[PDB]
Enzyme design. Structure first.
Site, PDB file in Angstrom:
ATOM      1  N   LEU A  87      36.317  11.941 -18.662  1.00 29.41           N
ATOM      2  CA  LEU A  87      36.836  11.075 -17.545  1.00 29.41           C
ATOM      3  C   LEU A  87      38.164  11.090 -17.316  1.00 29.41           C
ATOM      4  O   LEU A  87      38.704  10.726 -16.619  1.00 29.41           O
ATOM      5  CB  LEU A  87      36.266   9.585 -17.498  1.00 29.41           C
ATOM      6  CG  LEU A  87      34.673   9.402 -17.285  1.00 29.41           C
ATOM      7  CD1 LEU A  87      34.076   8.019 -17.620  1.00 29.41           C
ATOM      8  CD2 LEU A  87      34.539   9.863 -16.463  1.00 29.41           C
ATOM      9  N   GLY A 107      43.827   8.828 -21.966  1.00 32.94           N
ATOM     10  CA  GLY A 107      45.183   8.198 -22.459  1.00 32.94           C
ATOM     11  C   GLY A 107      46.271   8.653 -22.842  1.00 32.94           C
ATOM     12  O   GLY A 107      46.062   9.682 -23.372  1.00 32.94           O
ATOM     13  N   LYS A 108      46.871   7.651 -23.600  1.00 31.31           N
ATOM     14  CA  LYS A 108      48.111   7.707 -24.779  1.00 31.31           C
ATOM     15  C   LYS A 108      47.038   7.956 -26.135  1.00 31.31           C
ATOM     16  O   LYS A 108      48.068   8.921 -26.629  1.00 31.31           O
ATOM     17  CB  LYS A 108      49.494   6.582 -24.565  1.00 31.31           C
ATOM     18  CG  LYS A 108      49.690   6.583 -23.510  1.00 31.31           C
ATOM     19  CD  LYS A 108      51.126   5.445 -23.417  1.00 31.31           C
ATOM     20  CE  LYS A 108      52.138   5.202 -22.266  1.00 31.31           C
ATOM     21  NZ  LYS A 108      52.935   4.439 -21.664  1.00 31.31           N
ATOM     22  N   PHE A 109      46.646   7.057 -26.389  1.00 31.42           N
ATOM     23  CA  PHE A 109      46.114   7.074 -27.403  1.00 31.42           C
ATOM     24  C   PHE A 109      44.900   8.226 -27.543  1.00 31.42           C
ATOM     25  O   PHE A 109      44.836   8.555 -28.797  1.00 31.42           O
ATOM     26  CB  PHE A 109      45.904   5.716 -27.648  1.00 31.42           C
ATOM     27  CG  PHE A 109      46.832   4.893 -27.919  1.00 31.42           C
ATOM     28  CD1 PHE A 109      47.005   4.354 -27.082  1.00 31.42           C
ATOM     29  CD2 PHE A 109      47.719   4.540 -29.205  1.00 31.42           C
ATOM     30  CE1 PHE A 109      48.278   3.391 -26.535  1.00 31.42           C
ATOM     31  CE2 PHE A 109      48.626   3.504 -29.278  1.00 31.42           C
ATOM     32  CZ  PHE A 109      49.124   3.476 -27.634  1.00 31.42           C
ATOM     33  N   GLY A 110      44.001   8.414 -26.988  1.00 36.69           N
ATOM     34  CA  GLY A 110      42.903   9.217 -26.466  1.00 36.69           C
ATOM     35  C   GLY A 110      42.227   9.075 -25.538  1.00 36.69           C
ATOM     36  O   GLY A 110      41.991   8.243 -24.769  1.00 36.69           O
ATOM     37  N   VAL A 155      38.688   9.866 -22.626  1.00 40.33           N
ATOM     38  CA  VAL A 155      37.524   8.814 -22.981  1.00 40.33           C
ATOM     39  C   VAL A 155      36.431   9.963 -22.190  1.00 40.33           C
ATOM     40  O   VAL A 155      36.564  10.768 -21.090  1.00 40.33           O
ATOM     41  CB  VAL A 155      37.631   7.383 -21.132  1.00 40.33           C
ATOM     42  CG1 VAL A 155      38.583   6.195 -21.977  1.00 40.33           C
ATOM     43  CG2 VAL A 155      39.215   8.180 -20.381  1.00 40.33           C
ATOM     44  N   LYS A 159      35.695   5.555 -24.849  1.00 39.96           N
ATOM     45  CA  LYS A 159      37.116   5.756 -24.997  1.00 39.96           C
ATOM     46  C   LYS A 159      37.735   5.997 -26.757  1.00 39.96           C
ATOM     47  O   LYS A 159      36.505   5.201 -28.251  1.00 39.96           O
ATOM     48  CB  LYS A 159      38.379   4.468 -24.782  1.00 39.96           C
ATOM     49  CG  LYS A 159      39.628   4.827 -25.047  1.00 39.96           C
ATOM     50  CD  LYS A 159      40.607   4.301 -23.833  1.00 39.96           C
ATOM     51  CE  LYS A 159      41.916   4.287 -24.251  1.00 39.96           C
ATOM     52  NZ  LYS A 159      42.906   3.698 -23.272  1.00 39.96           N
ATOM     53  N   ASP A 161      49.606  -5.752 -16.711  1.00 47.93           N
ATOM     54  CA  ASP A 161      49.997  -6.320 -15.920  1.00 47.93           C
ATOM     55  C   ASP A 161      49.299  -4.990 -14.325  1.00 47.93           C
ATOM     56  O   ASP A 161      48.805  -4.210 -15.159  1.00 47.93           O
ATOM     57  CB  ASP A 161      51.669  -5.199 -15.800  1.00 47.93           C
ATOM     58  CG  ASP A 161      52.696  -5.474 -14.645  1.00 47.93           C
ATOM     59  OD1 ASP A 161      52.161  -6.260 -14.428  1.00 47.93           O
ATOM     60  OD2 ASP A 161      53.168  -4.684 -14.676  1.00 47.93           O
TER      61      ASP A 161
END
Lengths: 275, 43
Positions: free
Chosen positions: A18, A21-24, A26, A41, A135
């Site tokens: 999908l 991300g920054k860390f891993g 999805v 994730k 945010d």
């Protein structure tokens, strides 16, 4: 399922990537037994250790175990490997809001006002329960099966926002004067961003953006908002009352819900639950 | 080689069913227990 329900990767069938991300990454996945589709994730343990986000992640789990909201993306549960941490997340069928916006060019008054109420609600919940949240901005918002806005999480991977970073990212618009200058900031920042988000969804671009960085900088501090004459009057009003230099005179959440224009165009409806 | 279920009609049908007829989540995934940092991370 008595009171055990400890899950492993062997309990999932994996479908398709999908996104990253920054860390891993999805992955779209589904439980073998129930066939219930989730967004899985996969975090690298080494990456969350490096960044010193052990506590932050713990807090994310503790919040998501106590709090629930239809416009905040859900953590159903988590497991972990020798190398990996897995978050079993709510799947957002209509993907990222920013991606939907580029494809739509602009959102009609209906879709925009529905999001603004949904968000105003999710945020009222978040401030009542005294918890941090990711945010708000199109990148950080996902969409349900009927285009319900989903705040991606309670913002554990959120980095202390830099002036320089926001300038380059093109996200300077979602930073009010207080943040721009040295000055202290509270959850009244949320109010500004909803004003920015509302302008962006309707027009197609953030109100303060330009070609020069010094320009974008000047327009924010002077709150130099310029509405296209095609803009609906109700919307112009709401954005005028949210995008104000002074934090203490920004239309509160309780009154964003009550604002005539929202009332007139919101088609918000809770998604189905069980019991 | 994407499996049939995670593409085209078979998925949209599965999402539609999951949306309008969701399951009891508490019974499917159990209670979220606090993150044990000593058990999960090094140092």
């Amino acid at each position: 399922s008595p009171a055990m329900r400890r899950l492993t990767v062997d309990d999932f069938e994996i479908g398709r990537p999908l996104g990253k991300g920054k860390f891993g990454n999805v992955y779209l996945a589904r439980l073998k037994e129930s066939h219930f589709i989730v967004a899985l994730k996969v975090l690298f343990k080494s990456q969350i250790e490096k960044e010193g986000l052990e506590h932050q992640l713990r807090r994310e789990i503790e919040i998501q175990a106590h709090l629930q909201h239809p416009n905040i993306l859900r953590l159903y549960n988590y497991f972990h490997d020798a190398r990996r941490v897995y978050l079993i997340l709510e799947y957002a069928p209509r993907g990222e809001l920013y991606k939907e916006l580029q494809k739509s060019e602009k959102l009609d008054e209906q879709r925009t006002a529905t999001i603004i109420e949904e968000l105003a609600d999710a945020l009222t919940y978040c401030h009542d329960k005294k918890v941090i949240h990711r945010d708000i901005k199109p990148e950080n918002l996902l969409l349900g099966f009927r285009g319900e806005v989903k705040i991606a999480d309670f913002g554990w991977s959120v980095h202390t926002p830099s002036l320089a970073a926001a300038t380059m990212c093109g996200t300077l618009d979602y930073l009010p004067p207080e943040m721009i200058e040295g000055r202290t900031y509270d959850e009244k920042v949320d109010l500004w961003c909803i004003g920015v988000l509302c302008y962006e969804l309707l027009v197609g671009y953030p109100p303060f953006e330009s070609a020069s960085h010094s320009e974008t900088y000047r327009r924010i501090l002077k709150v130099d908002v310029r509405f296209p004459l095609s803009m609906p009057l109700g919307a112009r009003d709401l954005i005028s009352r949210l995008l104000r230099y002074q934090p203490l005179e920004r239309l509160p959440l309780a009154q964003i819900l009550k604002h005539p224009w929202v009332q007139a165009h919101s088609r918000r409806v809770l998604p189905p639950c069980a019991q | 080689p994407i499996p049939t279920w995670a593409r085209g009609t078979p998925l949209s049908q599965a999402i539609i069913h999951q949306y309008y007829h969701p399951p009891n989540l508490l019974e499917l995934f159990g209670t979220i227990l606090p993150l044990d940092l000593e058990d999960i991370f090094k140092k």
